[PDB]
Design a protein around this ligand. Structure first.
Ligand SMILES: c1ccc(-c2ccccn2)nc1
Ligand SMILES: [Cl-]
Ligand SMILES: [Cl-]
Ligand SMILES: [Cl-]
Ligand SMILES: [Cl-]
Ligand SMILES: [Cl-]
Ligand code: NA
Ligand SMILES: [O]
Ligand SMILES: [V+3]
Length: 129
């Protein structure tokens, strides 16, 4: 599913990401825009051989099992394919674990490079939330 911006914002809000560990909702919307272009089916390889999955491009190196990332962990206890669903629940629940872990949203390279330090409230401008 390719979410609309406000559609995604509303789903993320319902799932409690607004100001989760201090990250206002626009952070999460921004991150998804640049990680996945709002596409739940997005998959991308990394140079280490891991793959990033879904709307928030959760990585098989640590967070999910895809059976093809040697030495990796599955800290969200989920098949990576579960993260490609039109329902964002599994991705959000995993994201909450990731962001709570010490490094905050820096885990998301696109967030760090494109959202951090910017007016992220612009990403929820016009949305009824
Ligand atoms: C190295 C550098 C960037 C990325 C990335 C960017 C957006 C979405 C997913 N992965 N991955 C590895
Ligand atoms: Cl993509
Ligand atoms: Cl990429
Ligand atoms: Cl596993
Ligand atoms: Cl694996
Ligand atoms: Cl933080
Ligand atoms: Na894994
Ligand atoms: O990534
Ligand atoms: V990547």
């Amino acid at each position: 599913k390719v979410f609309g911006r406000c559609e995604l914002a509303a789903a993320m809000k319902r799932h409690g990401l607004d100001n989760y560990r201090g990250y206002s909702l626009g952070n999460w919307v921004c991150a998804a825009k640049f990680e996945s272009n709002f596409n739940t089916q997005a998959t991308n390889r990394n140079t280490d051989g891991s793959t990033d999955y879904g709307i928030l491009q959760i990585n098989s190196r640590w967070w999910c099992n895809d059976g093809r990332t040697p030495g990796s962990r599955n800290l969200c206890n989920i098949p990576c394919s579960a993260l490609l669903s039109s329902d964002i629940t599994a991705s959000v629940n995993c994201a909450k674990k990731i962001v709570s872990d010490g490094n905050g949203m820096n885990a998301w390279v696109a967030w760090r490079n494109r959202c951090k330090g910017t007016d992220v409230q612009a990403w929820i401008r016009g949305c009824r939330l």
